[PDB]
Amino acid sequence: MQEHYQPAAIEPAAQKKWDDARISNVSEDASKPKYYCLSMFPYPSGKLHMGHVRNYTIGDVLSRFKLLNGFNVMQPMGWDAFGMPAENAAMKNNVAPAAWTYDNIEYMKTQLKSLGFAVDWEREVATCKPEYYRWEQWLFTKLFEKGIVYRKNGTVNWDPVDQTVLANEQVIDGRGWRSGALIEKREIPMYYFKITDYAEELLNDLDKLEHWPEQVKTMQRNWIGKSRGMTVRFAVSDDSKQGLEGDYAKFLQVYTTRPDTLMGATYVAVAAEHPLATAAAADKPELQAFIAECKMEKKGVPTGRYVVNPLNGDKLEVWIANYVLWGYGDGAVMAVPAHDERDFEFAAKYNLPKKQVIAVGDNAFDANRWQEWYGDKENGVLVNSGDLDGLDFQTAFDAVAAKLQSQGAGEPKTQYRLRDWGISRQRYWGCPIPIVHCEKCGNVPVPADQLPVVLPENVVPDGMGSPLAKMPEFYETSCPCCGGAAKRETDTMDTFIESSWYFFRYMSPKFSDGMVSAESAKYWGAVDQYIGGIEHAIAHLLYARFFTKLMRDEGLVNVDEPFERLLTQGMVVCETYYRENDKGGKDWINPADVELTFDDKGRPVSAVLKADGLPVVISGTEKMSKSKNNGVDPQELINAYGADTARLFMMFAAPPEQSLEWSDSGVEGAHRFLRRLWRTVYEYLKQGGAVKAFAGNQDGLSKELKDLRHKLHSTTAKVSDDYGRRQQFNTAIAAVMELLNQYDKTDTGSEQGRAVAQEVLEAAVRLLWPIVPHICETLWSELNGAKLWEAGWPTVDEAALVKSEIEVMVQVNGKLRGKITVAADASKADLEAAALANEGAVKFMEGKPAKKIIVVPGRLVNIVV
Ligand SMILES: Nc1ncnc2c1ncn2[C@@H]1O[C@H](COP(=O)(O)OP(=O)(O)OP(=O)(O)O)[C@@H](O)[C@H]1O
Ligand SMILES: CC(C)C[C@H](N)CO
Ligand SMILES: [Mg+2]
Ligand SMILES: [Mg+2]
Ligand SMILES: [Zn+2]
């Protein structure tokens, strides 16, 4: 064994050894229980950085832990290679998108292989390859036939800088998710996935996800935004039917989420476009006037027409209001000023009545001043509401529904804030949309036998709109239904399509007859463990659940939910710098290329780019990001310190969910521990070579060696709990450091000492193998001739956890009066102290003090009083 810890020697050799053994290349093996551990795959948008090291080392620790515990572990990696992240990176580096993406993939694969993650590289996928994207084109056509995918014009989110529409989940603070530019509204036709058809299932199935962070589930619940409401019909009065036709002569229909307040409605408000607006305004120019202004600030006019409250018979006047849009669904609303602030305003304004139908506790009701308990929907009971009196919100809701339905005057109605998912993009680098536009047949899907519609890879976008829209060699084609001249769709699919199903593709990435083979889907089931940032909560983590339910309903998979456990690792953060460019954007600058000037107290005041000595903007600590050019490249840390140092630092510096600020001192501290581990094994082997590890009954072992075995097996129990239940890796390392601390203070030079040292060191290197496998593999081979991954996870010897104690009898004047339990090395004075604390001795000494305390070593204490 060499004295110096030399990562450049031992890390390539350990990786070759694992690769040759094919430890990470797995099949559908029914002999071992499956474990599918997945880290969210990266965009080819730059070099990986130490934040990726944290993400992917967490996954590797969990994978290697389960591997040592006898699971069939699939841990796959691949490339989220289509769409805006890869294409924008290519354009920023003046490379064609395809050439950029494939070269960047090769660099990222080199970076990850140097880190020694236990990855099944035979399951590698690149989502920009036709072998991948043909299957999402397939699913698209299947769903398009059923109307679950559809094309429709409408108002959309337009990003003027990325020059594309965006989905609602890609608008962050009114800005595009990659550009940071303010989003505009445009009317552009788009292709949509009808995710609202699955809104109830996507909401309710969140309750299944006991092992997701509550915050992720709450964010998705609020994004879906279910509201249980009530459709309510007010019959039009017999004298207000002039001009109306059809159902609009019969009743006025409204939607409300407070049907518990229906007994308190005092008027209704109607849109300027709703038919009763027109009928009342037909002979009313002062009403056509309001209609014209309309066709915020609440303005309203009475119409003279009246409708009838179905629950109490009240006649209510219909109002035109500018706050009622002809897209409301009904285009008309009821008004309860006593319990809704908006209605309280528009009724205090126009002096419209306010009737109280809710009481919350003993709060007085002032009909002149609004209070926020008027809107309390959780702690209220109904008043002035007939047989609804005394009901709470949920009970009154169901009772109002029964009432309305008994007379056919209403029914429950659910709405959602969720809107359908707009997926088409005016961008080149993405999956082609398998649609052909025929002047005779309409928008027709490309038949399955003609998929994929292949994206040409030799395109350099000119930065002026959709490049495929300028390529008749791509879009001129024949109609698949009639054979006539037609045009391919030139919009492409958004990147989030590929990431919504890649975790199924990993199960059978070479399956050429479908998205995923039935046999492999049945074997791997769902992802047991998913690791990625909380930034994915509203987009990917919602889209992926939706796609899973789609594929299940197509009969491709048999799970309802893609990810069983989710760990959202904290962000590695570091300094950021940029310059404003002449295009109005920001050129981000790596901290390594910056020279800082400081203060008298150490404040960074100015910063310059070393290349030109010209200023840069100090932007402050922020998430390490490829797109902000602030990453620390792990390959450079590996070249200087070794991959194990990079991995150990990221696992030790904080609990995995906590933000982790970059520091060079953290790097050196991790390396010094690895030197300590190396030196500890080297010095042990130097003084006699390896021996058979202690095992079995430990009677006859010295107290110091028993204490070390207690610490050893306590440490195994703790690390096991930390990897397997708590998923906390910093405390596992600290626990092994404490074991080594005790080892250092223990004399292990004797024959039994060396046996215990071997046991300690064999356990330590296995306990740490998931975190720093290179050094642990190498040290194990110097200690022990067997294969580490065949020796398995260390076992807790419960016999080693029993404390060394003795029971001593206490007497008073010779008569035995009790029994005490003392440490095995307790002094004679500890026995005297403990014996005089025995309730038997105290009770039978009768207050008298001891005349003498006879002690027989470790057997008997005799208190003479
Ligand atoms: N600073 C970071 N700390 C921890 N995990 C990170 C960090 N940056 C990215 N990740 C994680 O790495 C995975 C891949 O993300 P991605 O490819 O978007 O990297 P990125 O640095 O965010 O790139 P980009 O800036 O182009 O979005 C995700 O699970 C993401 O949460
Ligand atoms: C699962 C994917 C949406 C992850 C992205 N490629 C990185 O944020
Ligand atoms: Mg369950
Ligand atoms: Mg990212
Ligand atoms: Zn046709």
Author numbering: 1 to 295, 307 to 876
Per the authors:
To understand the role of this peptide-plane flip on the global conformational changes and its effects on enzymatic catalysis, L550 was mutated to an alanine or glycine and the crystallization of both mutants was performed. Comparison of the captured apo and pre-transition states of both mutants show the same large domain movement, including closure of the active site by the CP1 hairpin and structurally associated α-helix (M84-N93), that were seen for the WT structures. Despite the occurrence of these substrate-induced changes, including the shift of the priming loop, no peptide-plane flip was observed in either mutant pre-transition state structure. This is likely the result of the absence of the clash between the side chains of E169 of the CP1 hairpin and A550/G550 although the side chain of E169 maintains the same interactions as seen for the WT pre-transition structure. Our biochemical data show that in the absence of steric constraints the peptide-plane flip is not necessary for the amino acid activation.
To correctly aminoacylate tRNALeu, leucyl-tRNA synthetase (LeuRS) catalyzes three reactions: activation of leucine by ATP to form leucyl-adenylate (Leu-AMP), transfer of this amino acid to tRNALeu and post-transfer editing of any mischarged product. Mechanistically similar to other adenylate-forming enzymes, the class Ia aminoacyl-tRNA synthetase (aaRS) LeuRS charges tRNALeu isoacceptors, which are essential substrates for protein translation. We have solved crystal structures for all enzymatic states of Neisseria gonorrhoeae LeuRS during Leu-AMP formation.
